[PDB]
Design an enzyme around this catalytic site. Structure first.
Site, PDB file in Angstrom:
ATOM      1  N   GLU A  64     -10.855  -4.635   9.132  1.00  0.00           N
ATOM      2  CA  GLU A  64     -12.034  -5.026   8.402  1.00  0.00           C
ATOM      3  C   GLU A  64     -13.138  -4.145   9.012  1.00  0.00           C
ATOM      4  O   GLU A  64     -13.154  -3.870  10.223  1.00  0.00           O
ATOM      5  CB  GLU A  64     -12.371  -6.517   8.635  1.00  0.00           C
ATOM      6  N   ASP A  92      -7.383  -8.145   7.954  1.00  0.00           N
ATOM      7  CA  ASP A  92      -8.560  -7.940   8.821  1.00  0.00           C
ATOM      8  C   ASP A  92      -8.213  -7.355  10.152  1.00  0.00           C
ATOM      9  O   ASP A  92      -8.966  -6.536  10.673  1.00  0.00           O
ATOM     10  CB  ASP A  92      -9.306  -9.251   9.009  1.00  0.00           C
ATOM     11  N   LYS A 118      -5.604 -18.682  -0.488  1.00  0.00           N
ATOM     12  CA  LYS A 118      -5.268 -17.378   0.168  1.00  0.00           C
ATOM     13  C   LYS A 118      -3.752 -17.216   0.270  1.00  0.00           C
ATOM     14  O   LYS A 118      -3.194 -16.143   0.031  1.00  0.00           O
ATOM     15  CB  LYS A 118      -5.923 -17.270   1.567  1.00  0.00           C
TER      16      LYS A 118
END
Ligand SMILES: O=C(O)/C(O)=C/C(=O)C1(Cc2ccc(Cl)cc2)CCN(Cc2ccccc2)CC1
Ligand SMILES: [Mn+2]
Ligand SMILES: [Mn+2]
Length: 179
Positions: A64, A92, A118
């Site tokens: 990320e 991430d 998710k």
């Protein structure tokens, strides 16, 4: 010029603010207009970086915060060298110690509700998920929370602080009912 925008630039450090502006512009968006999203992206950035700071020296590769293209390069490097499977969606972090990609979630809803979304949406059996809320709750894949407790504790604290600063400015409700 919203209050929210000026609030974000005060609340987060300049490097985070700049990464988030860049992320927004890259996926088409405007930080001056979509200001709740701007705050959320800043938040998610900070958390991801606080999270990489838990655990030892070399533990995480940080995905990320990079350019979309460079982020995939590094993802490919890690795949092509660990044998781990190439995820559908950018993660991430990568956990060198546990050998998995992680996606960190920050939510203004029930930890439960965001986790399922998710999970279904990542449709990636091997990527680990760790959600935090602005309420102190967290849920992680296989109840395995990666870091020790004090590293997660300080993330949770930080998020409640962001929640309070927002509320003292009457931006919280709007922020919560923007998700
Ligand atoms: O919300 C997150 O926690 C997050 O990590 C989002 C992302 O990295 C994006 C990629 C993505 C990651 C995970 C999932 Cl389920 C769907 C999309 C790209 C930037 N944009 C948002 C989607
Ligand atoms: Mn991400
Ligand atoms: Mn994430």
């Amino acid at each position: 010029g919203s209050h929210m925008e000026d609030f974000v630039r005060q609340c987060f450090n300049p490097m985070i603010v700049e990464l988030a502006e860049k992320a927004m512009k890259e996926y088409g968006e405007d930080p001056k207009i979509e200001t709740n999203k701007f705050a959320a992206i800043c938040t998610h950035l900070e958390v991801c970086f606080m999270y990489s700071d838990g655990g030892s020296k070399h533990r995480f590769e940080i995905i990320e915060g990079r350019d979309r293209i460079m982020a995939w390069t590094v993802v490919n490097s890690i795949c092509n060298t660990t044998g781990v499977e190439k995820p559908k969606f950018l993660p991430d972090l990568y956990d060198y110690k546990e050998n998995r990609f992680i996606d960190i979630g920050v939510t203004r809803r029930e930890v439960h509700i965001y986790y399922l979304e998710k999970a279904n949406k990542i449709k990636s059996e091997k990527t680990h998920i760790h959600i935090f809320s602005f309420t102190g709750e967290e849920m992680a894949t296989k109840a395995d929370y990666t870091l020790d407790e004090e590293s997660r504790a300080r993330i949770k604290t930080r998020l409640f602080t962001i929640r309070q600063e927002m509320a003292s400015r009457s931006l919280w409700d709007s922020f919560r009912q923007s998700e």
